[PDB]
Amino acid sequence: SRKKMGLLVMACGTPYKEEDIERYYTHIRRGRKPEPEMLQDLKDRYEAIGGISPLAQITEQQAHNLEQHLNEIQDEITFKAYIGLKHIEPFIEDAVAEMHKDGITEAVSIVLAPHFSTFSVQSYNKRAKEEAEKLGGLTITSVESWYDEPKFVTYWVDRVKETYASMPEDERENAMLIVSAHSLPEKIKEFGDPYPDQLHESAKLIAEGAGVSEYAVGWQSEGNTPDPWLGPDVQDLTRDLFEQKGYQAFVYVPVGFVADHLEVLYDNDYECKVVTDDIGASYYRPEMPNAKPEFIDALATVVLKKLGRV
Ligand SMILES: *Cc1c(C)c(=O)n2c(=O)c(C)c(C)n12
Ligand SMILES: [Cl-]
Ligand SMILES: [Cl-]
Ligand SMILES: [Cl-]
Ligand SMILES: [Cu+2]
Ligand SMILES: [Cu+2]
Ligand SMILES: [Cu+2]
Ligand SMILES: [Cu+2]
Ligand SMILES: [Mg+2]
Ligand SMILES: [Mg+2]
Ligand SMILES: [Mg+2]
The missing domain is CATH 3.40.50.1400 (Rossmann fold)
Known part of the structure; x- marks a missing residue:
């Protein structure tokens, strides 16, 4: 029997459709709704780059591919991925509450940004740990950086x-x-x-x-x-x-x-x-990592090194 662990994958988040632009940017701007000209500009920018919904799917694909690859390359742990986002649902606290509801007691987290900062990574990790502490009975070990993998x-x-x-x-x-x-x-x-x-x-x-x-x-x-x-x-x-x-x-x-x-x-x-x-x-401007296998293998190695298993 393999040990079950949550895999908490955290990111900034993206609108899922054009009608989400207003609320996403209001959240980024700390409650200040963009004025109508800015709303229109942002819609035009997303149209110019080929649309919103493909961009929104990439985080989902990264988390799912990472779960499946981690479960294939070692035989001790079964991971289940949960996505927690900073600026749109599912929020970080929603993901931790879901892990708790599903019976997860041990999780590892990673932010889809390779450099540590106090503004982003540390705040995401602190929010996840504080939600886990409020619920009790669930612990999270958090990757802080991985730019040097x-x-x-x-x-x-x-x-x-x-x-x-x-x-x-x-x-x-x-x-x-x-x-x-x-x-x-x-x-x-x-x-x-x-x-x-x-x-x-x-x-x-x-x-x-x-x-x-x-x-x-x-x-x-x-x-x-x-x-x-x-x-x-x-x-x-x-x-x-x-x-x-x-x-x-x-x-x-x-x-x-x-x-x-x-x-x-x-x-x-x-x-x-x-x-x-x-x-x-x-x-x-060369291709971004997205959910390509070489990048997923890099992230799986980051996770297993954090757990001491490679
Ligand atoms: C949404 C987003 C991404 C992808 C990123 O790297 N960052 C930041 O550094 C901030 C402050 C925000 C917002 N985002
Ligand atoms: Cl941290
Ligand atoms: Cl780390
Ligand atoms: Cl660090
Ligand atoms: Cu930005
Ligand atoms: Cu999913
Ligand atoms: Cu694989
Ligand atoms: Cu410099
Ligand atoms: Mg529509
Ligand atoms: Mg700018
Ligand atoms: Mg380090």
């Missing part, structure tokens, strides 16, 4: 190598690699938040494995509050590096994101591409 580094190294090999000769000799994650308010530094250092380490490990000597670290998708957010933003960084040294190709690796999403398909493949098109450079 070799199988995850290798996913991106191989995609970068393929992109550079695909380039014409003069591009390959005059290209710049930009490695990025979602910006956060700068005030996280008051806590010693390692998020910026972990993004810089991801960039070092990917550029090193791919043999790319010219690379830079940037941030993207900052929200709107009066206090400053981490920078430079990818759009400004691209133009600055072009003005400095005249690169003919820019390769974007938004390593902080794990799936196709508005903040990649729009904030890179539209907003960064506007800049590259303006300066006359080529744009490349």
Whole structure:
């Protein structure tokens, strides 16, 4: 008989249909409903990148593929996946309550974002643990970061190598690699938040494995509050590096994101591409991990290492 464990997979969440945009963004904006022009802009952006519902399905597929792969590659534990989201149902607390109702007493959790921060990962883990404590009789051990898992580094190294090999000769000799994650308010530094250092380490490990000597670290998708957010933003960084040294190709690796999403398909493949098109450079942005088997195997290894079983 195998031990049963819950597998709590946590993520930001996505609207499921266009009519969910209002409530999703109201939640992100801490109760402030977007004005009508912004609502219309957001709908247009989702239409421009091919629609909402495919983006919403990816998290579901990642959690289910991870459950099935973990159950196939070892014989001691039977995992059952539960999805808990920050900004739309099923919420984190809903998922923990469901695990408790179903009779789970032991769970492991992972956030679908490879870098730890106080703003995101630590808050998701704290919310899950506090719900478990309120209900009693259920314990959660939480993955905090996994950007340094070799199988995850290798996913991106191989995609970068393929992109550079695909380039014409003069591009390959005059290209710049930009490695990025979602910006956060700068005030996280008051806590010693390692998020910026972990993004810089991801960039070092990917550029090193791919043999790319010219690379830079940037941030993207900052929200709107009066206090400053981490920078430079990818759009400004691209133009600055072009003005400095005249690169003919820019390769974007938004390593902080794990799936196709508005903040990649729009904030890179539209907003960064506007800049590259303006300066006359080529744009490349390799495939996101999504639910591909190589990435699922990386996540399964993260989980089993956290449990001491590999
Ligand atoms: C929704 C979302 C994703 C995918 C992400 O990485 N982040 C952040 O870092 C914030 C603050 C939010 C919201 N999201
Ligand atoms: Cl934590
Ligand atoms: Cl960890
Ligand atoms: Cl960490
Ligand atoms: Cu499901
Ligand atoms: Cu498998
Ligand atoms: Cu830097
Ligand atoms: Cu965002
Ligand atoms: Mg409709
Ligand atoms: Mg670690
Ligand atoms: Mg923006």
